[PDB]
PDB file of C-alpha atoms in Angstrom:
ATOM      1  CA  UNK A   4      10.261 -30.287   4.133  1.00  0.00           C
ATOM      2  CA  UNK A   5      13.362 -29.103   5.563  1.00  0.00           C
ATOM      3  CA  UNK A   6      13.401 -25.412   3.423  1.00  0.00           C
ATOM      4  CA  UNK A   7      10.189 -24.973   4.444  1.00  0.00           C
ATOM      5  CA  UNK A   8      11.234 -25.515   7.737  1.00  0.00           C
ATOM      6  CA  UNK A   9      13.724 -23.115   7.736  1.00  0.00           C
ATOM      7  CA  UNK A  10      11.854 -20.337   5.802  1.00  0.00           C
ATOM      8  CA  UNK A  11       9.534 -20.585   8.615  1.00  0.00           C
ATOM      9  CA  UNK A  12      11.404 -20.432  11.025  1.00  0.00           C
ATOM     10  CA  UNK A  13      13.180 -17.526  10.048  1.00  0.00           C
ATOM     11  CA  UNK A  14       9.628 -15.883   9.360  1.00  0.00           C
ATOM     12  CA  UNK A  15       9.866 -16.171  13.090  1.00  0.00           C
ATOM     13  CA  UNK A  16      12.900 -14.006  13.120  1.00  0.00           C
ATOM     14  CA  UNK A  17      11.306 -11.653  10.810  1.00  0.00           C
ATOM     15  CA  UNK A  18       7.910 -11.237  13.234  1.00  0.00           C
ATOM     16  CA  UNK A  19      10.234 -11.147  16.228  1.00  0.00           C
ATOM     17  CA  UNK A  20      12.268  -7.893  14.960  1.00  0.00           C
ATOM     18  CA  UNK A  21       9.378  -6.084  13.742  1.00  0.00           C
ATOM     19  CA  UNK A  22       8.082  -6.295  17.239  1.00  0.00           C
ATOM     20  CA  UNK A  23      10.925  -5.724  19.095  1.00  0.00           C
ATOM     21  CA  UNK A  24      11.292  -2.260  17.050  1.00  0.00           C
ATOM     22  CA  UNK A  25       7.996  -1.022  16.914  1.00  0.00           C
ATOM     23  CA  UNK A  26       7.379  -2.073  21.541  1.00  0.00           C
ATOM     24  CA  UNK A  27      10.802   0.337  21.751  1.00  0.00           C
ATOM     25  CA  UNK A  28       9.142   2.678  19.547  1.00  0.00           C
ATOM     26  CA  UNK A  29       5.991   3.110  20.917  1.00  0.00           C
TER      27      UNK A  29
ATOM     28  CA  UNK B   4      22.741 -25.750  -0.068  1.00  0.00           C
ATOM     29  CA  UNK B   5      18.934 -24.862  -0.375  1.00  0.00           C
ATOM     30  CA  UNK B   6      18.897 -24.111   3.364  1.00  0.00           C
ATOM     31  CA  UNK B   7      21.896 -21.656   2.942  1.00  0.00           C
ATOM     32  CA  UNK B   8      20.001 -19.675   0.415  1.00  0.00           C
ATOM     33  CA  UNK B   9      16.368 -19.892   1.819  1.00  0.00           C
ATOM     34  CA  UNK B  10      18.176 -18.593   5.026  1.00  0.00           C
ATOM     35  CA  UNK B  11      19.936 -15.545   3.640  1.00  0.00           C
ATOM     36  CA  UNK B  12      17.101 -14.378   1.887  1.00  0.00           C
ATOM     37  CA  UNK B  13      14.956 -14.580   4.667  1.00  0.00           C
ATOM     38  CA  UNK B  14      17.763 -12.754   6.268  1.00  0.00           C
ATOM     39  CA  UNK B  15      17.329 -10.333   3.660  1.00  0.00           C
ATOM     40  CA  UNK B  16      13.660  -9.949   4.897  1.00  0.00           C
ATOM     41  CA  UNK B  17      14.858  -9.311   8.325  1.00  0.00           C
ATOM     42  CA  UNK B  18      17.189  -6.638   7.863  1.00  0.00           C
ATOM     43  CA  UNK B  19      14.790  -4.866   5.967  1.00  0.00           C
ATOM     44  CA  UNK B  20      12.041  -5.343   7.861  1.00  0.00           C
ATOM     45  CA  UNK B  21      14.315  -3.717  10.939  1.00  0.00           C
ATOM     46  CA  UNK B  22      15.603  -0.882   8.521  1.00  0.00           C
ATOM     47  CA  UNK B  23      11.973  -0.322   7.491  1.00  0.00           C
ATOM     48  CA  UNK B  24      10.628  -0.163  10.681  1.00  0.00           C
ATOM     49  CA  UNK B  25      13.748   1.720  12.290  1.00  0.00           C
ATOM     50  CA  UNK B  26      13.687   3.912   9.038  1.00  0.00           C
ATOM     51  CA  UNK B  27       9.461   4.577   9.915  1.00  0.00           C
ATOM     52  CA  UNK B  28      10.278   4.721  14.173  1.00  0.00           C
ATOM     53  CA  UNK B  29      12.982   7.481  13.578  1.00  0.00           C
TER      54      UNK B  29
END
């Protein structure tokens, strides 16, 4: 439970910055 | 321990995610 947690969490992180980049490079 | 590791490499994922999508934006 808690590394999948985490791992999720951070996959989060990971869908967050790819957004974040490609909004400011649109 | 686990969480440590599970982290970083999902940290991995996230800076290259945001130096593959700054590396496609530029």
């Amino acid at each position: 439970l808690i590394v999948n947690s985490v791992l999720l969490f951070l996959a989060f992180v990971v869908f967050l910055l790819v957004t974040l980049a490609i909004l400011t490079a649109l």
